[PDB]
């Protein structure tokens, strides 16, 4: 009930942040792009799989900066 609403709000934010971030990376804004991806990672309960996926899809120096941000 409220549990569904809680989960809905997180799932919307998660996908919206990843999609905003992806678009900023396409636009060559890595700075703001990574900031949004770190918002998606923040709401991720168990992020290790997500981080391994990001590591496959990002240049390593960018993955590395992302880690330094969390």
């Amino acid at each position: 009930g409220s549990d569904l609403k809680d989960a809905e709000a997180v799932q919307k934010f998660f996908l919206e942040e990843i999609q905003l971030g992806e678009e900023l990376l396409a636009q060559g804004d890595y700075e703001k792009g990574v900031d949004h991806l770190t918002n998606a990672i923040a709401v991720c309960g168990q992020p290790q799989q997500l981080l391994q996926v990001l590591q496959q899809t990002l240049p390593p120096p960018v993955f590395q900066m992302l880690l330094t941000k969390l």
Binding site: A9, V10, Q11, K12, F14, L15
Partner: peptide, 15 residues
């Protein structure tokens, strides 16, 4: 909400 694309992406993330 719920939307399939949010459900799928979240399931795909393993989060």
């Amino acid at each position: 909400g719920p939307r399939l694309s949010r459900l799928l992406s979240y399931a795909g993330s393993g989060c």
